[PDB]
Amino acid sequence: APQVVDKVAAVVNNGVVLESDVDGLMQSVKLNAAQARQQLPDDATLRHQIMERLIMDQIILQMGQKMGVKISDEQLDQAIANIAKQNNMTLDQMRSRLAYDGLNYNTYRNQIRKEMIISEVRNNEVRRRITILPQEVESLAQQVGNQNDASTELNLSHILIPLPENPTSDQVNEAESQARAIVDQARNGADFGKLAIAHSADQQALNGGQMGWGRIQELPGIFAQALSTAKKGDIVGPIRSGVGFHILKVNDLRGESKNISDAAQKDRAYRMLMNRKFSEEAASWMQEQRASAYVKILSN
Amino acid sequence: AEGFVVKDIHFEGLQRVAVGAALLSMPVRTGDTVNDEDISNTIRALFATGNFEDVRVLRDGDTLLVQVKERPTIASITFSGNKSVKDDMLKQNLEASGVRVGESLDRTTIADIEKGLEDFYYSVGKYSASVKAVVTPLPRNRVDLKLVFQEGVSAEIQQINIVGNHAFTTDELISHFQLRDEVPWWNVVGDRKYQKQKLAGDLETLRSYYLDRGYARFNIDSTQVSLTPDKKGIYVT
Amino acid sequence: LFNSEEDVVKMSPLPTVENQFTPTTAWSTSVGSGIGNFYSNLHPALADNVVYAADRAGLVKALNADDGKEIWSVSLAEKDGWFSKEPALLSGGVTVSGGHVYIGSEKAQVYALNTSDGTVAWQTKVAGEALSRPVVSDGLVLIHTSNGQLQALNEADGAVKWTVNLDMPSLSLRGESAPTTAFGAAVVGGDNGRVSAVLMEQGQMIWQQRISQATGSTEIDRLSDVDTTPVVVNGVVFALAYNGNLTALDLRSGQIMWKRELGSVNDFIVDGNRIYLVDQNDRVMALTIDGGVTLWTQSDLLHRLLTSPVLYNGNLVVGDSEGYLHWINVEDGRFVAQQKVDSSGFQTEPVAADGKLLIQAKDGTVYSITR
Amino acid sequence: EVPDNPPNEIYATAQQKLQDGNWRQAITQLEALDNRYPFGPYSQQVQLDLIYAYYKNADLPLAQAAIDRFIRLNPTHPNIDYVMYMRGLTNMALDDSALQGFFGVDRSDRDPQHARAAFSDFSKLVRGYPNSQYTTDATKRLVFLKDRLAKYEYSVAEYYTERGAWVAVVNRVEGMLRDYPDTQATRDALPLMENAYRQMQMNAQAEKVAKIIAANSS
């Protein structure tokens, strides 16, 4: 007869996690996986992971409340808009939200608010534990500064179609045909990473054939000659060689007018180093706070 | 609507808290239009009162059934395993933290009290000591708190070193100290046990000793308290 | 009252083993009163077929390695007896580089004696009691003082060149970390739980990573002293903290490569593709250089207060607080032999070099343990 | 030492002992019934009986503690006036001595702290609950306590008159007039104030006090 409506799934310090919130995040991750179910095919492990997610969220929220961080509705305004691709946000966003979960308009904003609170506290503490030495940002940028001899640096990927030491004419023809087909498919908009994974015999095949940033003059002579007139996004044909056919792709390029004789580079090194240290400190803080708190799972 | 019309609200499990207080703690007053979020907020508020260990809300269609499990009341406090700290000092330490016979058991404070006692054992120099609490459920929603003490062997000061004393000698300076680096065979009334408060008083005594001789600039740059990896060889510098 | 009734938590019994070989002591010479009951790093040293040893009192002896015959002996106590002929309180492990013998002292003194005769080549005053083994490299002597100062002294002149300040927690473990040299960079542990790399030219920090876990609030659970010597090989730095993690870091970047949940304050050996480590609970282990995967574990010596291991003749030799030397097969971890050497026990590191194995007992008796 | 019989049997035994007048055993039974079943149908009745037994057993500090606990836990209990009256009785009992009472010693010169506390408690009871059945006895005890406190001030003023501390005498009698104007002790003390004024040669104040005395000769 009686129907269970809601219950406490876990107790976290003075707060609680409700089965309703657990179901809400269940639906959230199910929708996320609907796009690609390979992201989260697990069910029980996913449920426990979400349990931990809500536990950490409650810990962080209680800590932030203790400190006194607060957010106004004015900060909420706009902090959602200009994000949905071309959406007419703050009027059309609300109307579309009615069709998915917007039974009550406030729900969405109350969630957004909460999330911002947690972010602001996390960022505050994690960055407070970070320490950066200039010597470190200098060393990280020194490699690129030395490698910036070229006025333009190219991000490149490569694919190899192999040949034996003593190939036959038929083998050469087959390799050339395969390379030309791959080049045509790439120029037709096919994913270069998938093609490299499927066909490339190079060690970077499983990595999508990505070679990364490089100075053109430091590349193999054939690569330097072929790429002398290449630009971002270009697909270049096969290159014959005693060991097979080589295919090259240009992903991105960078450069500046400053005379490198490094020059306005340590800022980017600072960004990357800060990102890495933030990740490490966040992991260490997310587990320093889980150990130190009181948690009891009553999910039973 | 949604949650249906609430005709009446019944509480279950209430032992100490009056139904009036619980009703006052809920945000909904048979509003006749209750949604799921309202029920969630009601649960959150009821738990925020701090009187319940578990809360659950069920719907009969017309009736809102609030099932709560009140946090157990303390029946008795038992100390076992302690050979140095007396039960009296422990019992007064309990009342400071709210653990007292006849009151409720704040589970979230358990860790706190435990750590506090361990800290005390570390102040005396009894490192490796543990103080673990066991809560056994007694009927009629009661509990008995037993604090299992497992004290180790007290660490003994191996050395007291002063670095930078060129006018006086380490022996003379530490002869006035409360902490003893060594005890003569004839003296069987003192030991080499450590205590933080005694160390602070000792630093003050050293400062007074150097200031009473007209130096007027004596400064303790730093103080390091080390400990052997076996945790029975505390060192002072 | 209770201090006598109080009982320790654990102590393993003596493992029962059969000796596959007969270990014997080639010679044994008394160096004095020894360190005694003071936790110190003072251990012998070997160089050019000579053995250098000392004790807390101040005695320093150079002995013939082949038979232990004394070559010369000196005392570092007060020359003029300014005060009761105060002991030198030698604590820094005896190091031998070039023609100099470097010894640290708890009176914030560092002595450099002459190999040929034992006269004091020079003496320097440091920021604090030198509890670490002096490390000689690039014409500099690195000293890690008790108050978290890493100082570099000129090998010849003896004057302090540069000083790096390291944080010191409220409570720490006795002993300090001896730095390691690699391509002009000194990697040193710290009592706060961080491994830091500095330059030798002027002492400019490079990077500083945290190795500990410190999953606790009270002081004892926050003890994370990196009192071991980091080992550098093929561009990766292996470090290990108390209650912390056995981590591998990038030499240039200081970035964690892999992590493990073992802790200790004794040194560990890194050879080939394996890491022979002694846990803080006196449990020998063997791992992989690639990761924390364990190959074997010997848990028969828990709470025996073992010393750091030494790889002698392909067998891992470890001392014991009761005065026993245990051999262990690296391949399997099985006890291969057991011997009762001394009665006062062992606390300091054994030494293995040039086909010779040396160990100094708590009473100061240097022992040459041959097969 | 108390068996673990069901709650009804324990309560019946406690009631029987209370009726028989054996305060100690009734107290033990009630303590067992209260610390075994902290929140039950017996809680309020057991607490009230414990207060009564502690009072009759001369365990006054325990009675005060129990009264405070009951007042704080049940601020609006219908029988709360009885608890206030019992607190007043306990404080008044702390202000008594049997050995001195046997010899007919007037204890108004001793510590008035407990008398002041009893006066405060009885005044609280009388003002809060004018219609309670303990209001008449509370009023009589209030009158007695006011007289006793005024007699204490009179004793201090008399001693300082003996010592020759005239300013102290004047201040003490002025305090008596401001605090206990209608007591007999103030009437007795008035001539002391006049004498203190006379000794300091302030004849105007002495004349004023003499006029006050004459207007209230009786």
Curated annotation (Swiss-Prot), chain A:
Record's keyword annotation contains Transmembrane helix: no
The subcellular localization recorded is: Periplasm
GO cellular component entries: outer membrane-bounded periplasmic space
Catalysed reaction per UniProt? Answer: [protein]-peptidylproline (omega=180) = [protein]-peptidylproline (omega=0)
Q: Which keywords accompany this UniProt record?
A: Chaperone, Isomerase, Periplasm, Repeat, Rotamase, Signal
PROSITE patterns in the record: PPIC_PPIASE_1, PPIC_PPIASE_2
Function statement: Chaperone involved in the correct folding and assembly of outer membrane proteins, such as OmpA, OmpF and LamB. Recognizes specific patterns of aromatic residues and the orientation of their side chains, which are found more frequently in integral outer membrane proteins. May act in both early periplasmic and late outer membrane-associated steps of protein maturation. Essential for the survival of E.coli in stationary phase. Required for pilus biogenesis.
The identity of this protein, by name, is Chaperone SurA
- Gene name as annotated: surA
Swiss-Prot record, chain B:
Description of the deletion phenotype = Deletion is lethal. Depletion results in the accumulation of incorrectly assembled outer membrane proteins, including TolC, OmpF, OmpC and OmpA. Decreased expression leads to decreased susceptibility to contact-dependent growth inhibition (CDI), and decreased expression of outer membrane proteins (including in this study LamB) as well as up-regulation of periplasmic protease DegP.
Q: Which domain of life is it from?
A: Bacteria
The family classification in the record reads: Belongs to the BamA family.
Summarize subunit and interaction data from the UniProt record for this chain: Part of the Bam complex, which is composed of the outer membrane protein BamA, and four lipoproteins BamB, BamC, BamD and BamE. BamA interacts directly with BamB and the BamCDE subcomplex. The Bam complex has the shape of a hat, with the BamA beta-barrel crown in the outer membrane and the periplasmic brim formed by the BamA POTRA domains and the 4 lipoproteins.
| Domain free text | Contains 5 N-terminal periplasmic polypeptide transport-associated (POTRA) domains which interact with other subunits of the complex, may recruit substrates from the periplasm into the outer membrane and also act as a chaperone. The C-terminal region forms a discontinuous 16-stranded beta-barrel transmembrane region. The central pore is ellipsoid, and probably closed by extracellular loop 6, perhaps with the aid of other loops.
Q: Which source organism does the UniProt entry give?
A: Escherichia coli (strain K12)
From Swiss-Prot, chain C:
Q: Which Pfam families match?
A: PQQ_2 (PF13360)
> What GO biological process terms are annotated to this protein in UniProt?
Gram-negative-bacterium-type cell outer membrane assembly; protein insertion into membrane
* One GO cellular component term: membrane
SUPFAM superfamilies recorded: Quinoprotein alcohol dehydrogenase-like
Q: Which UniProt keywords apply?
A: Cell outer membrane, Lipoprotein, Membrane, Palmitate, Signal
Mode of membrane association = Lipid-anchor
The record's section on Gene3D superfamilies has: YVTN repeat-like/Quinoprotein amine dehydrogenase
Q: Which domain of life is it from?
A: Bacteria
Localization per record: Cell outer membrane
**What's a single GO MF annotation on this record?**
identical protein binding
Q: Which family does it belong to?
A: Belongs to the BamB family.
Q: How does it assemble?
A: Part of the Bam complex, which is composed of the outer membrane protein BamA, and four lipoproteins BamB, BamC, BamD and BamE. Monomer. Interacts directly with BamA. The Bam complex has the shape of a hat, with the BamA beta-barrel crown in the outer membrane and the periplasmic brim formed by the BamA POTRA domains and the 4 lipoproteins.
- Job description of the protein: Part of the outer membrane protein assembly complex (Bam), which is involved in assembly and insertion of beta-barrel proteins into the outer membrane. Nonessential member of the complex, which may orient the flexible periplasmic domain of BamA for interaction with other Bam components, chaperones and nascent outer membrane proteins. Efficient substrate folding and insertion into the outer membrane requires all 5 subunits.
What protein am I looking at?
Outer membrane protein assembly factor BamB
What species is given as this protein's source? Answer: Escherichia coli (strain K12)
Q: Which gene encodes it?
A: bamB
Curated annotation (Swiss-Prot), chain D:
- Indicate where this protein is primarily found: membrane
What happens when the protein's gene is inactivated? Depletion decreases the density of outer membrane proteins, but does not significantly affect transport of lipopolysaccharides to the outer membrane.
Q: Which UniProt keywords apply?
A: Cell outer membrane, Lipoprotein, Membrane, Palmitate, Signal
User: A GO term (biological process) for this protein?
Assistant: protein insertion into membrane
Q: Which family does it belong to?
A: Belongs to the BamD family.
> Subunit details for this protein?
Part of the Bam complex, which is composed of the outer membrane protein BamA, and four lipoproteins BamB, BamC, BamD and BamE. Forms a subcomplex with BamC and BamE. Interacts directly with BamA. The Bam complex has the shape of a hat, with the BamA beta-barrel crown in the outer membrane and the periplasmic brim formed by the BamA POTRA domains and the 4 lipoproteins.
- Matches recorded under NCBIfam families: OM_YfiO (TIGR03302), PRK10866.1 (NF008119)
What the record says about its domains? The N-terminal may interact with various proteins as a chaperone to assist in the folding and insertion of proteins into the outer membrane. The C-terminal region may serve as the link between BamA, BamC and BamE.
Protein name per the record: Outer membrane protein assembly factor BamD
Question: What gene makes this protein?
Answer: bamD
